[PDB]
């Protein structure tokens, strides 16, 4: 995978299909829905001109693939408007495919988790801390706004044990934190994807 | 106390079904059997039907022995291409009122370290499960389901351990664990063991 072809896999990574969304339903309740698993980039709501309203489904834009991940696993027949919506991944990748079985593959080697809707007061050191109790850390960071220097509510954890990563996910996915519930996974990236 | 045993029966039927759009039409009930089966073995399968066309209408509703199948497959199957499209798995949308009582005995199931685990090859046995699982804590029983008439295991059971650390750490670590070179789907369980008696 060349580094322009591992970003297309990586873009299509970040984002799901949501379907059967009530008529009465708009943008932002989507995006209310599926903000506790990362930061929504964007939202692609399909649109029919004659009728004055959208299709019944959506593509939703996380900043990175393990969100978009975390949304296919919890998200998938949530009650939404009276009906169950449909959570699925992009039905074109048309090739790209095979770029991300391999980032899937290079993303075992490292002992990775994803965390997100993490309380804007909590510190890199507070979920450092939290986390080190199933295991060694070697890094945990939180993602922060380049301007600001404010952490965007999401971060990743390596540990130096896979046992630990493992103990970490099924501990701590849902687990109440500041008032908000964690939203825990195993990463399917490896760190610098593009280097 | 939250319904009677016809309630409690009624809601547990509902638990044990699964909705799957989305079916490419060359599809049939074959395909969707061989494709759900891994979580248990399927009770039923109602194919939507058009006739005038003489094609299904895309979605199907499979059926399981027991409403731990069904959550499996809704976790697992969700988004699987088949047939080259991304298939959708739901929960019937039915239900009508039986939604207080599926959530009455979710949270009895909680007062229980109970596991499910399908996808157990014939040759395996109880103990053999046991002695496989009780690795990650002290047993309290492992049981395989059996055919009434023959006494064969149906590739299904359930394990009770004594401390919840225990199932929560069994889950994790046993599912989709090869063995006897299939893939057992293991979850901790939706309903309490006997949720039909008083
Ligand atoms: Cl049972």
């Not at 322009?4 to 009530?22: D, F, K, T, W």
């Not at 506790?36 to 004659?50: A, N």
């Not at 939404?80 to 959570?87: A, H, M, P, S, Y």
């Not at 954890?157 to 939203?183: C, H, P, T, W």
């Amino acid at each position: 995978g060349s580094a322009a072809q591992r970003q297309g896999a990586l873009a299509i990574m970040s984002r799901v299909y949501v379907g059967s969304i009530y008529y009465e339903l708009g943008e932002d309740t989507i995006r209310q829905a599926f903000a506790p698993f990362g930061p929504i980039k964007s939202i692609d709501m399909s649109w029919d001109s004659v009728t004055m309203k959208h299709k019944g489904f959506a593509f939703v834009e996380y900043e990175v693939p393990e969100a978009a991940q975390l949304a296919l696993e919890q998200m998938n027949s949530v009650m939404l408007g009276g009906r169950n919506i449909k959570v699925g991944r992009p039905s074109n990748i048309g090739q790209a495919q095979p770029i991300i079985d391999q980032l899937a593959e290079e993303a075992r080697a490292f002992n990775r988790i994803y965390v997100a809707s993490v309380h804007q007061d909590l510190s890199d050191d507070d979920i450092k801390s939290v986390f080190e109790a199933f295991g060694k850390i070697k890094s945990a960071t939180l993602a922060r706004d380049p301007t600001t220097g404010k952490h965007k509510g999401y971060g990743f954890i390596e540990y130096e044990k896979a046992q630990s990563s493992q103990d970490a996910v099924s501990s701590m996915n849902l687990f109440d934190l500041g008032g908000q519930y964690l939203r825990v996974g195993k990463a399917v990236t490896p760190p610098m994807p593009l280097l």
